[PDB]
Amino acid sequence: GAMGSMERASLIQKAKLAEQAERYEDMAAFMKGAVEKGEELSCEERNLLSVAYKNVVGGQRAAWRVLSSIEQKSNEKGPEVREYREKVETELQGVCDTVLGLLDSHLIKEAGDAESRVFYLKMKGDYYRYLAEVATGDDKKRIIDSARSAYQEAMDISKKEMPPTNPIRLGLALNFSVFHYEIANSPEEAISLAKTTFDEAMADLHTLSEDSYKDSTLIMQLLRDNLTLWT
Amino acid sequence: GAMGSMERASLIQKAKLAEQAERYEDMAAFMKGAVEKGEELSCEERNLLSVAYKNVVGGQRAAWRVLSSIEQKSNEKGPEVREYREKVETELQGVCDTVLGLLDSHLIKEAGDAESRVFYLKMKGDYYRYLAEVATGDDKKRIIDSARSAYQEAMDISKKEMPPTNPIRLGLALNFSVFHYEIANSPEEAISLAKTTFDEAMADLHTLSEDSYKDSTLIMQLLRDNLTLWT
Amino acid sequence: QRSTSTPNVH
Amino acid sequence: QRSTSTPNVH
Numbered sequence: 001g002a003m004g005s006m007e008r009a010s011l012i013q014k015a016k017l018a019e020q021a022e023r024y025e026d027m028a029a030f031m032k033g034a035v036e037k038g039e040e041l042s043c044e045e046r047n048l049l050s051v052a053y054k055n056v057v058g059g060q061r062a063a064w065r066v067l068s069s070i071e072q073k074s075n076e077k078g079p080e081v082r083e084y085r086e087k088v089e090t091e092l093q094g095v096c097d098t099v100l101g102l103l104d105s106h107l108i109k110e111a112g113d114a115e116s117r118v119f120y121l122k123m124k125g126d127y128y129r130y131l132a133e134v135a136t137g138d139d140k141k142r143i144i145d146s147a148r149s150a151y152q153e154a155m156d157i158s159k160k161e162m163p164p165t166n167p168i169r170l171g172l173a174l175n176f177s178v179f180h181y182e183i184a185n186s187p188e189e190a191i192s193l194a195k196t197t198f199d200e201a202m203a204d205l206h207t208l209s210e211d212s213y214k215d216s217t218l219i220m221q222l223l224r225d226n227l228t229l230w231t
Numbered sequence: 232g233a234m235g236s237m238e239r240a241s242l243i244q245k246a247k248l249a250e251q252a253e254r255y256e257d258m259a260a261f262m263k264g265a266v267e268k269g270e271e272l273s274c275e276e277r278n279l280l281s282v283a284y285k286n287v288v289g290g291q292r293a294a295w296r297v298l299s300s301i302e303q304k305s306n307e308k309g310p311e312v313r314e315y316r317e318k319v320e321t322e323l324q325g326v327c328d329t330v331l332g333l334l335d336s337h338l339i340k341e342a343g344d345a346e347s348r349v350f351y352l353k354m355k356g357d358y359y360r361y362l363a364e365v366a367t368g369d370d371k372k373r374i375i376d377s378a379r380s381a382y383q384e385a386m387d388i389s390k391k392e393m394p395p396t397n398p399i400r401l402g403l404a405l406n407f408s409v410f411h412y413e414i415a416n417s418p419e420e421a422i423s424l425a426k427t428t429f430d431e432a433m434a435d436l437h438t439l440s441e442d443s444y445k446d447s448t449l450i451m452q453l454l455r456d457n458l459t460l461w462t
Numbered sequence: 463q464r465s466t467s468t469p470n471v472h
Numbered sequence: 473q474r475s476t477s478t479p480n481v482h
């Protein structure tokens with residue numbers, strides 16, 4: 001709402017300036033305003049949206065992890081650590097709720113190219129996964145199944161529509177395997193997904209694209225890093 | 232006001248947790264709430280106040296400098312760069328206004344030990360200096376003289392009350408010399424102040440304190456770095 | 463050591 | 473290159 005008076009092109013421009021200035025909360029607000037104009041986002045613009053919110057929630061996750069570790073050490077004696085961890089947690093959930101709301105209200109569509117559909121469903125899986133990192137009760141079951149369903153729909157599309165070196169397909173599989181290992185407690189599924197993804201990218205390495213091959217080969221290396229850590 | 236229901240000790244505790252979590256905006260809010268309890272701040276607690284607000288305004292200054300450079304390059308063609316630079320500038324001024332308000336309303340007193348009086352007057356000089364970095368009109372003259380007067384009062388006290396290796400005295404002189412060089416356009420004053428400060432610390436090096444000598448020797452090296460850059 | 467997910471780029 | 477002011481510590 002705060003962004004409603006600004007032209008879409010100016011919001012994009014300002015998101016790029018905020019990225020340059022390392023003002024990621026501003027850049028997420030600008031991109032939210034751009035999304036709310038109701039037009040599709042290009043691949044460049046999806047990157048801006050992704051970078052902004054990942055930076056914001058990344059700092060919140062890092063803070064939450066620090067506070068949670070302090071909280072668990074102090075349980076192994078006031079309310080302050082728990083109260084402040086709950087504070088940061090509530091802010092993190094709000095950002096994830098904002099992103100998931102934009103995905104549901106504006107971005108996830110039946111139409112569009114494969115890149116966009118896979119990317120947004122991957123994003124939905126990621127931000128449910130971030131909610132799952134801090135969930136506990138009846139909410140936690142609902143969230144974990146929501147993440148898996150979004151990842152699975154993204155995988156079905158990526159395998160049918162995308163070459164096995166496509167960086168969005170690779171990044172999705174990487175993130176789905178992290179979900180399996182860290183969230184779903186399924187190390188076998190995580191390992192087999194990451195190995196299958198790596199091997200299938202290597203078998204069809206000729207499908208690397210001139211405009212994205214550096215991204216593809218980075219994710220391939222991260223798949224191998226996880227496989228080394230998990231084995 | 233947001234912090235008024237929390238006990239002072241809990242605010243201090245939470246400021247320390249926020250520092251650990253690299254949540255500096257939270258840690259500044261907690262320390263503002265502690266200051267507003269109306270009791271003096273210890274040397275430990277002044278450090279928490281200092282670290283929090285310096286991190287917050289430091290990120291704003293860094294962002295402002297990025298945007299200002301982009302703005303000046305585009306003047307050597309829409310309003311977006313200027314509008315966003317003005318946005319960040321207004322936020323920076325608000326943080327400086329908040330800090331200066333706390334100094335005037337709560338922290339700067341006639342009583343107290345030399346450390347506290349010098350430290351707060353140094354802080355006042357610093358946050359006026361940060362306002363001067365982004366000022367222009369009739370405001371800019373008022374701000375520059377306010378910074379100088381606060382630094383000068385802090386120097387008079389530090390020279391009378393503190394050994395020449397005291398880290399607050401050193402940090403004040405370092406920051407005053409930066410003021411002279413970068414704000415007041417007086418390189419001669421900056422160089423002579425930094426050289427006098429370094430030489431006088433070296434001449435009375437035996438006054439280093441067991442509990443702060445690492446801080447003193449760090450500032451001494453920074454004085455020499457500036458002297459090398461300025462000569 | 464945590465697993466590594468997709469990073470930010472560009 | 474900017475002049476260096478007092479840094480944050482501890």
Ligand SMILES: *CC(=O)N1CC[C@@]2(CCN(S(=O)(=O)c3ccc(Br)c(F)c3)C2)C1
Nearest residue numbers: 043046047050119167168171215469471
């Ligand atoms: C074209 C398009 O829709 N893109 C490409 C960039 C993004 C934003 C981030 N995703 S991603 O999460 O799939 C991803 C991030 C980093 C890397 Br190295 C990667 F290969 C994929 C793609 C928008």
Ligand SMILES: *CC(=O)N1CC[C@@]2(CCN(S(=O)(=O)c3ccc(Br)c(F)c3)C2)C1
Nearest residue numbers: 274277278281350398399402446479481
């Ligand atoms: C005891 C006391 O009042 N102190 C010591 C710490 C502070 C917070 C920062 N100041 S400072 O700006 O004078 C300063 C910062 C860093 C360094 Br290495 C230094 F020597 C001085 C002192 C509160």
Ligand SMILES: [Cl-]
Nearest residue numbers: 083084087245
């Ligand atoms: Cl809290």
Ligand SMILES: [Cl-]
Nearest residue numbers: 014314315318
């Ligand atoms: Cl703006």
Ligand SMILES: [Mg+2]
Nearest residue numbers: 005006007008
């Ligand atoms: Mg118009």
Ligand SMILES: [Mg+2]
Nearest residue numbers: 074076077078
């Ligand atoms: Mg006990």
Ligand SMILES: [Mg+2]
Nearest residue numbers: 086089090093
């Ligand atoms: Mg909660």
Ligand SMILES: [Mg+2]
Nearest residue numbers: 236237238239
């Ligand atoms: Mg009480």
Ligand SMILES: [Mg+2]
Nearest residue numbers: 305307308309
């Ligand atoms: Mg022109």
Ligand SMILES: [Mg+2]
Nearest residue numbers: 317320321324
């Ligand atoms: Mg202004």
